[PDB]
Coordinates of C-alpha atoms and ligand atoms in Angstrom, one line a residue:
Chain A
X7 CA 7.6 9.1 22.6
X8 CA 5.6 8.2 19.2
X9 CA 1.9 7.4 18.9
X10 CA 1.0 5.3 15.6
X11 CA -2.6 4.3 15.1
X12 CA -3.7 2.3 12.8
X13 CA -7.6 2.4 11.0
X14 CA -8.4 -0.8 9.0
X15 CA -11.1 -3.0 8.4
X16 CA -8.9 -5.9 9.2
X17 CA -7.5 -4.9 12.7
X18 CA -6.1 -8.7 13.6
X19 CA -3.8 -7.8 10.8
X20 CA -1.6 -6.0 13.0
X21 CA -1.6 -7.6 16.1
X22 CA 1.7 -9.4 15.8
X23 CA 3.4 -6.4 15.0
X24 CA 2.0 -4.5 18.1
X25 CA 3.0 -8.0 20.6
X26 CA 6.5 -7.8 19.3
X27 CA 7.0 -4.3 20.9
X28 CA 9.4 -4.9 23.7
X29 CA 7.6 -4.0 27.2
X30 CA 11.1 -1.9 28.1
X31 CA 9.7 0.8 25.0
X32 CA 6.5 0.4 26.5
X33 CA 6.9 1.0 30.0
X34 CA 9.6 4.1 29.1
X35 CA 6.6 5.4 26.8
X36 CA 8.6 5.4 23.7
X37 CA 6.5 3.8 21.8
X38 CA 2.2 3.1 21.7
X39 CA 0.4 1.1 18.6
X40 CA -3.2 1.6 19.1
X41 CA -5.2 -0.6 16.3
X42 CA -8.9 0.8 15.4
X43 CA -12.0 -1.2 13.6
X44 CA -12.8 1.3 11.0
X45 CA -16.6 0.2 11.5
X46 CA -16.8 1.5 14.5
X47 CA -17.5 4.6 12.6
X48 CA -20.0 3.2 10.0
X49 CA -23.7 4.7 9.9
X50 CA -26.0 1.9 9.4
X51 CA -27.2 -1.3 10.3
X52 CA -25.1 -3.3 7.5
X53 CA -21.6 -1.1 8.7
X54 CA -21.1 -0.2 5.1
X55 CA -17.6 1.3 4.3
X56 CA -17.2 1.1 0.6
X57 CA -19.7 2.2 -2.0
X58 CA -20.0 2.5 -6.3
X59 CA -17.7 4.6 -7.4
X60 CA -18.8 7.9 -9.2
X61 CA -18.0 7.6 -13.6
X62 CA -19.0 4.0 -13.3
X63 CA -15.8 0.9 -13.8
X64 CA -15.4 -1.6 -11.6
X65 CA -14.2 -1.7 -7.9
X66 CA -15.9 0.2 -5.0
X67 CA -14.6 3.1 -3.3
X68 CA -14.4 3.5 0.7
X69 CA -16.8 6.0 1.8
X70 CA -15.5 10.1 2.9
X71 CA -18.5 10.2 5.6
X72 CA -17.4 6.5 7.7
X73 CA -13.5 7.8 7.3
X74 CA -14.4 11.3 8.1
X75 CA -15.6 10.5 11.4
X76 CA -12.4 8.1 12.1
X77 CA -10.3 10.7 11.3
X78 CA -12.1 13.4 12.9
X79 CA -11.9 11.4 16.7
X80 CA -7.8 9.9 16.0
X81 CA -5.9 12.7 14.7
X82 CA -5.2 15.9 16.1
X83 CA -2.9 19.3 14.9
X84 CA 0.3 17.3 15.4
X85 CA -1.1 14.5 13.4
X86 CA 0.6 13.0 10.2
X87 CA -1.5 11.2 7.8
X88 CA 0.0 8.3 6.0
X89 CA -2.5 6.8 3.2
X90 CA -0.6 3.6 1.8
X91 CA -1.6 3.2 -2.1
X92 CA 0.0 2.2 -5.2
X93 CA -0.8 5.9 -6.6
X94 CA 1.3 7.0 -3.6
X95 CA 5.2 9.3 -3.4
X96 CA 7.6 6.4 -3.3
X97 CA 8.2 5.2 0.7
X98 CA 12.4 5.3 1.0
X99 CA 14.6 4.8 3.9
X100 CA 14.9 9.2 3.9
X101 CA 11.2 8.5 4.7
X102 CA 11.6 6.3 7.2
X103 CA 14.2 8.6 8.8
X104 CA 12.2 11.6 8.5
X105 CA 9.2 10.2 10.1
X106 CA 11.0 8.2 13.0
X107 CA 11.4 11.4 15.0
X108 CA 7.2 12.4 14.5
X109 CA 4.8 12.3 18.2
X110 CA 1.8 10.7 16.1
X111 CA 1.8 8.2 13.0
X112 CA -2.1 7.7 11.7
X113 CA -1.8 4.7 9.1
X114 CA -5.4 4.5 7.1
X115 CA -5.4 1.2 5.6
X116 CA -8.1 0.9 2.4
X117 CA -8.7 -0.8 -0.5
X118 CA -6.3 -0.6 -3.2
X119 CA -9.3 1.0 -5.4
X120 CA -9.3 3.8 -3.0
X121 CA -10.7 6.0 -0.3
X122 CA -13.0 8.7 -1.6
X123 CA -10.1 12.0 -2.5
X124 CA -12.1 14.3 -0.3
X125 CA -10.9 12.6 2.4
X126 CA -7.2 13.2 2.2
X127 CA -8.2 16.8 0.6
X128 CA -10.4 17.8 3.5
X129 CA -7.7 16.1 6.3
X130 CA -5.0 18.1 4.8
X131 CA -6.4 21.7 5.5
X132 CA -5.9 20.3 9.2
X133 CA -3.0 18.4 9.4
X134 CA -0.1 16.9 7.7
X135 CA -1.2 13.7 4.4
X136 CA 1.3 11.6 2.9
X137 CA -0.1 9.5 0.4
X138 CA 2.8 6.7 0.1
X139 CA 3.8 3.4 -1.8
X140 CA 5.8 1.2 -0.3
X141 CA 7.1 -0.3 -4.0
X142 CA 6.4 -1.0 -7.9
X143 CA 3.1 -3.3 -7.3
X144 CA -0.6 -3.3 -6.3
X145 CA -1.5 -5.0 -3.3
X146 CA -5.1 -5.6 -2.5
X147 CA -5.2 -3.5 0.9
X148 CA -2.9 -0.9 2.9
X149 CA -2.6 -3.5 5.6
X150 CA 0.7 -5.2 4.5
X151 CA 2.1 -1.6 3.5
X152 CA 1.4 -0.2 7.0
X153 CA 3.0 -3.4 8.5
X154 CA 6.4 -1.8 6.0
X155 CA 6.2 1.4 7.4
X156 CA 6.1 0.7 11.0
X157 CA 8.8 -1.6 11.0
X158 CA 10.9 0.6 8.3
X159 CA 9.9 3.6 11.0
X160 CA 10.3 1.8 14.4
X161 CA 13.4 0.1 13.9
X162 CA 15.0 3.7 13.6
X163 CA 13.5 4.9 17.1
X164 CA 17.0 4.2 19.7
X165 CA 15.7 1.3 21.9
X166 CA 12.4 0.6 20.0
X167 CA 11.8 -3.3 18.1
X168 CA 24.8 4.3 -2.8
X169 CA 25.5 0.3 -3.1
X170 CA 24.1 -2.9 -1.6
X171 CA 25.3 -4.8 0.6
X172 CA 27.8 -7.8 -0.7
X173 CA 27.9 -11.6 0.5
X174 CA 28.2 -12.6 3.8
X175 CA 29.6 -15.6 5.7
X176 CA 30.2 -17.9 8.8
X177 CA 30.9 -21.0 10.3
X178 CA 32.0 -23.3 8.9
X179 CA 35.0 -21.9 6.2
X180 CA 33.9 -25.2 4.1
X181 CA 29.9 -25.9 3.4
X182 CA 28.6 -28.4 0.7
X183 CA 32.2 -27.6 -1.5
X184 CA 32.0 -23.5 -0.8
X185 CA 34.6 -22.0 1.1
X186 CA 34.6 -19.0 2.9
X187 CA 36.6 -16.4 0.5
X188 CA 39.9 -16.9 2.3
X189 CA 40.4 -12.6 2.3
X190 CA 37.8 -13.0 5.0
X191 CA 40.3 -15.2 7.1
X192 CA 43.3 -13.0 6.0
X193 CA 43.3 -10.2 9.1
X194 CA 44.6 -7.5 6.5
X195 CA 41.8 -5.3 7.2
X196 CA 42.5 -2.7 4.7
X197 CA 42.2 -5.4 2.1
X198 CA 39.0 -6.9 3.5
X199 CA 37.2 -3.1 3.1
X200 CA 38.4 -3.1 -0.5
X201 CA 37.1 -6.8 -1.3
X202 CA 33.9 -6.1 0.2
X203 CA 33.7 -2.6 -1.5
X204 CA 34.0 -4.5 -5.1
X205 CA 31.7 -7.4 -4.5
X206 CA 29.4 -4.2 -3.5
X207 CA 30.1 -2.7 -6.9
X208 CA 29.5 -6.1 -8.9
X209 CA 26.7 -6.7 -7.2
X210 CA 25.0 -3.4 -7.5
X211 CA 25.6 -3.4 -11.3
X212 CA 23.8 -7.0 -11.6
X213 CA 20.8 -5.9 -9.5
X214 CA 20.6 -2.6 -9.6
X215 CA 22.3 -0.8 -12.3
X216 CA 19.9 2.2 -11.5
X217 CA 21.8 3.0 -8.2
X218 CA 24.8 3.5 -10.3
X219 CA 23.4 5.9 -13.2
Chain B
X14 CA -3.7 -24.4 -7.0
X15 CA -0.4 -23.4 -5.8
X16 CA 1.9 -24.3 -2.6
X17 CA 3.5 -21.3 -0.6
X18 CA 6.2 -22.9 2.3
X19 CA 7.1 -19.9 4.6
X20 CA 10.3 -20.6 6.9
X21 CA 11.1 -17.6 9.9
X22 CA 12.2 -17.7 13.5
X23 CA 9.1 -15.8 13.7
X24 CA 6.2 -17.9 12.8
X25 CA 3.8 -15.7 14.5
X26 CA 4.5 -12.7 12.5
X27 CA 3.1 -14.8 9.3
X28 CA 0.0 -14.6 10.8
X29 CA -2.1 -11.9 9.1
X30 CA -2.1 -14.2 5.9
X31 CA -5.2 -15.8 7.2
X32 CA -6.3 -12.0 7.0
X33 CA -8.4 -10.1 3.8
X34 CA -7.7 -11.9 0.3
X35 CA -5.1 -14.3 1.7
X36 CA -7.3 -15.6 4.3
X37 CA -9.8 -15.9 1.0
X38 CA -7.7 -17.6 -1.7
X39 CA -6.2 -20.1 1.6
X40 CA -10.6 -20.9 2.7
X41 CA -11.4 -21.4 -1.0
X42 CA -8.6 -24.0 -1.1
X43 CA -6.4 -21.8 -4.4
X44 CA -3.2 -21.9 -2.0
X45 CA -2.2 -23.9 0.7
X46 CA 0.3 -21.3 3.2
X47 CA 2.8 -23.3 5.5
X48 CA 4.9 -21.3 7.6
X49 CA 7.7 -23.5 9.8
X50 CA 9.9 -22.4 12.6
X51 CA 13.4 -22.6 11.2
X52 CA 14.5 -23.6 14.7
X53 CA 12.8 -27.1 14.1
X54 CA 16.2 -28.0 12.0
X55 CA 18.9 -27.1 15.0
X56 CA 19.9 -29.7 17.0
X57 CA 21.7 -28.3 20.1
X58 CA 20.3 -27.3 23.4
X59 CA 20.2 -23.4 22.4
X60 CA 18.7 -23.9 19.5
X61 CA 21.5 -21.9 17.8
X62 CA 20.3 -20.4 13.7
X63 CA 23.0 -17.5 13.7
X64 CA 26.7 -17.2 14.6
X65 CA 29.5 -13.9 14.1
X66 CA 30.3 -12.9 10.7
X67 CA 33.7 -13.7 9.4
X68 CA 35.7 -10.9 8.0
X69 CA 34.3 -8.5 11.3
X70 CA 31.3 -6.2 11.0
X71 CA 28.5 -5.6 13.5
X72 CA 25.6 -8.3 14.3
X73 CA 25.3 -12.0 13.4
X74 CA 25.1 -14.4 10.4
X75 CA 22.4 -16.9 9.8
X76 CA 24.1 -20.2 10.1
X77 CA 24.0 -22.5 6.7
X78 CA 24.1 -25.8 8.0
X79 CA 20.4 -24.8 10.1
X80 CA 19.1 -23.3 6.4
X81 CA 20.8 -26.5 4.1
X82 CA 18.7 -28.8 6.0
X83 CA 15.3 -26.5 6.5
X84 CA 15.6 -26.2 2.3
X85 CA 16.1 -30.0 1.8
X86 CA 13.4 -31.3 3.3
X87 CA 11.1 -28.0 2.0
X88 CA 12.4 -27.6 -1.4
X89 CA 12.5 -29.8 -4.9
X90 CA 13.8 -29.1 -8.2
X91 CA 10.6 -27.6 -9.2
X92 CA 11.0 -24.7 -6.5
X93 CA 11.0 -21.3 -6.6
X94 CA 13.0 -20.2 -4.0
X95 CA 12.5 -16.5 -2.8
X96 CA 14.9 -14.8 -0.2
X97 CA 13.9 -11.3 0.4
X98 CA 16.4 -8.9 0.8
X99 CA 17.5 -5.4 0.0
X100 CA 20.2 -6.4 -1.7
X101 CA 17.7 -8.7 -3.9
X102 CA 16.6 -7.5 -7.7
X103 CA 13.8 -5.3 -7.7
X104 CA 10.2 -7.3 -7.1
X105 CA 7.7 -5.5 -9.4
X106 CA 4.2 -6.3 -10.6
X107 CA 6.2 -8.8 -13.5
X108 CA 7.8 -10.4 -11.1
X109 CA 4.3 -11.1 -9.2
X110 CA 2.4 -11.8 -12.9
X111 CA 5.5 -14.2 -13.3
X112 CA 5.2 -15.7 -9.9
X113 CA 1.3 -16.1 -10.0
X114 CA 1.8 -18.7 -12.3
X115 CA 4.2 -21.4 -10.0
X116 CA 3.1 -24.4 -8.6
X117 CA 5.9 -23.9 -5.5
X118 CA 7.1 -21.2 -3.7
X119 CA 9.1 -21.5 -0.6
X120 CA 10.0 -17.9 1.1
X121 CA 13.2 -18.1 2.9
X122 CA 13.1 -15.2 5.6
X123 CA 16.3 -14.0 7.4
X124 CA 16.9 -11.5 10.1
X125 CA 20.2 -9.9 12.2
X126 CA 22.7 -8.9 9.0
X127 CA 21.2 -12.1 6.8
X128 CA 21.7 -15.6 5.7
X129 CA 25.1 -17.5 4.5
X130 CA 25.5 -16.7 1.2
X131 CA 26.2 -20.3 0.6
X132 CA 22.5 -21.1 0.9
X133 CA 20.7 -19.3 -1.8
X134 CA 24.3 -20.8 -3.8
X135 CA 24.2 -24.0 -2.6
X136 CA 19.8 -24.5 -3.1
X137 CA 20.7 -22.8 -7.0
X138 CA 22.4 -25.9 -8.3
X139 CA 18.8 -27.6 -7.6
X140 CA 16.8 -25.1 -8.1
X141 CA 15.6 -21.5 -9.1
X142 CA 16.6 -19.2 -6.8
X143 CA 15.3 -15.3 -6.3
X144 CA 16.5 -12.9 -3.9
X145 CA 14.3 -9.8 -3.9
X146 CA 14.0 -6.6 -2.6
X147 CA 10.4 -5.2 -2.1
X148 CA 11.9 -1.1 -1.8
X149 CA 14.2 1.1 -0.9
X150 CA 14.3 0.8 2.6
X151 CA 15.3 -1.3 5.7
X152 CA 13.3 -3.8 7.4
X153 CA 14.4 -5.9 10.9
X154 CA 13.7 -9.2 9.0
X155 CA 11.8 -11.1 5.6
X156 CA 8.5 -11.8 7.5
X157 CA 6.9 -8.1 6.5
X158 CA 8.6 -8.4 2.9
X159 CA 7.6 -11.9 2.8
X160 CA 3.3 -10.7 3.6
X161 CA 4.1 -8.6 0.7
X162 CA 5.1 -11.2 -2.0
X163 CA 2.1 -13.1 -0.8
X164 CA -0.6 -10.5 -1.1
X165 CA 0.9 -9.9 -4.7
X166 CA 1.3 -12.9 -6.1
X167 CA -2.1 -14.1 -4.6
X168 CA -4.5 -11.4 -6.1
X169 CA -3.4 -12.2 -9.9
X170 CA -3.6 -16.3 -9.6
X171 CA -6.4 -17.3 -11.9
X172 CA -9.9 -18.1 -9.5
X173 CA -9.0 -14.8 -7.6
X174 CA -9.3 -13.3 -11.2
X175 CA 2.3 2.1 -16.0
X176 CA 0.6 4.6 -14.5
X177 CA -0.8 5.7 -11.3
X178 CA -4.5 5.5 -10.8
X179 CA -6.3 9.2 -10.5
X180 CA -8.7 10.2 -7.5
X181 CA -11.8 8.2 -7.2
X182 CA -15.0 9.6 -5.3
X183 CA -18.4 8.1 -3.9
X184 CA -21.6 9.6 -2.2
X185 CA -22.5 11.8 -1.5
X186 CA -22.1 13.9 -4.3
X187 CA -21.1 17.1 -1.8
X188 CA -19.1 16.6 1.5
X189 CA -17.9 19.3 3.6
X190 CA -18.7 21.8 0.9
X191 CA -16.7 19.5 -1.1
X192 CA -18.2 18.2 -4.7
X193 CA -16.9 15.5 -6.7
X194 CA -15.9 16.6 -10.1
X195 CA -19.2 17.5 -12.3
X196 CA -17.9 15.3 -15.2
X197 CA -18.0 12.2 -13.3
X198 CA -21.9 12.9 -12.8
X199 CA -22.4 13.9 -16.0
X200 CA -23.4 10.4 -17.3
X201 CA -21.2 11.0 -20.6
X202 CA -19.1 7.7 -20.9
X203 CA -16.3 9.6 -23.2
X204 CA -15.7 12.4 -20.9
X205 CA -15.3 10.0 -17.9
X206 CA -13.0 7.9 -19.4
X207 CA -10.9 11.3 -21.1
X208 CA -10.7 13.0 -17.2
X209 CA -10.0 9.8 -15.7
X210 CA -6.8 9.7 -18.5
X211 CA -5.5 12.9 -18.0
X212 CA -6.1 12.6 -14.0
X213 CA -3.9 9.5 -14.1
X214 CA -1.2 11.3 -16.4
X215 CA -1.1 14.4 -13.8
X216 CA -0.9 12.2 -11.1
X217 CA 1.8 10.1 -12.4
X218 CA 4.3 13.2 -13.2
X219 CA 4.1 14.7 -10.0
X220 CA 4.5 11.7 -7.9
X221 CA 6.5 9.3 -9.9
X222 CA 7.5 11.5 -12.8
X223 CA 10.2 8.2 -13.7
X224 CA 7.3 6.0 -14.9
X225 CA 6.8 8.7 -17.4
X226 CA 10.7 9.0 -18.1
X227 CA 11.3 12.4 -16.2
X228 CA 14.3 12.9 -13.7
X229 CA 12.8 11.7 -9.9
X230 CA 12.7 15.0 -7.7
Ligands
NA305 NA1 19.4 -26.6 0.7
NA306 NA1 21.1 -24.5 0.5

């Protein structure tokens, strides 16, 4: 069984993601999304949950008090944190992996200016805080990046939703003047590993000469 | 303003782009989104968009002859065609500064094992072509790498207009017997801007110490 909730100010962002679950997961309680309106925590009459941020610039900051609260009713001693933002540890598949066999996922989505650091400090003399990017650019808000993570995490739970990978084909062996590559058609086996292993190689150097050294 | 064509199986899972600054840019008329169901383009009773890989391997192929016709219709010369993949070059803030500036993007999204490689080399002798990963890691399908490109791209088109950023605070000035660092408070302008440096430097090096050219951990 995992729990993953998810605090944003934009909770229709993630309803797609939660009706895609397949009701099988459901009904075996493998799997639960809950999706929470960070305003329902918010003090005041105007549900403020960003505010100037201290040392003047631009931007506002999201407010420790409104995600204090949120955080105080969600998580629990079992609870681990993830804060998507482009200051974040790289997000990798050993991530993914690692965090597939957790009980309880809590995803707070902010700005991409910030939530207040006490936040994360004061949650992590409680429970576990993993401040994450999901890749090399700044996106305006977590939401996308939690949308990442629970597919990246969730497809790795049994039953629930190096070099690259080379080319790959089907019907028909002849499109628009390409063929298939005929090794693909040739039933030597042995042969078909080793083509597939080079185009792997070539393809790795062209793309991603850093996987390589 | 700028045209962004989405084509999926999933059209429903495009859906949070009428969400947060998306939703914005697509109101204030900077982009026009279109996402199409891929299956509009089959023409058999089953509706058929993938078919078993030749050469063996586990799961299915997306068909080319479904994909040939969705681009044709979708695409022109002027295209830039973006099929997200993990096996794609790496997409980066360039590559969202470089995309910002297109008048035509069409995002090609494929699930199961992926699409024909005849597609993206078949739609490249019209057009520019881009396959892209957004990280190291392993999604079901385009449509969640695909809400990525878009928030990315969208935030640095003009009208909506290194290092890691360091920790930023708001009030109160003391929260659970927690302060915000005096020099932030301290009104002085130089000293702000001199912690805020060396907080972005010390961030960087422990969590992505390759930005700064050290060995990853
Ligand atoms: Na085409
Ligand atoms: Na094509």
């Amino acid at each position: 069984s995992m729990k993953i909730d998810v605090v944003t100010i934009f909770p229709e962002y993630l309803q797609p993601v939660r009706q895609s679950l397949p009701g099988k997961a459901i009904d075996a309680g493998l799997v639960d999304v809950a999706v929470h309106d960070l305003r329902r925590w918010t003090h005041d009459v105007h549900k403020s949950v960003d505010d100037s941020p201290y040392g003047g610039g631009p931007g506002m900051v999201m407010k420790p008090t409104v995600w204090g609260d949120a955080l105080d009713e969600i998580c629990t001693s079992e609870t681990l944190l993830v804060v998507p933002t482009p200051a974040g540890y790289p997000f990798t598949q050993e991530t993914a992996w690692q965090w597939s066999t957790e009980d309880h996922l809590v995803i707070a989505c902010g700005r991409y200016e910030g939530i207040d650091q006490r936040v994360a400090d004061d949650a992590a003399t409680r429970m576990r805080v993993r401040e994450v990017s999901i890749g090399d650019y700044v996106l305006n808000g977590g939401e996308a990046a939690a949308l990442v993570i629970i597919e990246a995490v969730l497809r790795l739970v049994p039953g629930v939703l190096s070099l690259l990978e080379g080319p790959s084909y089907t019907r028909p062996p002849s499109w628009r003047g390409m063929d298939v590559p005929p090794v693909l058609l040739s039933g030597d086996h042995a042969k078909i590993a080793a083509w597939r292993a080079e185009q792997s190689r070539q393809r790795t150097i062209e793309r991603r000469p850093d996987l390589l050294g």
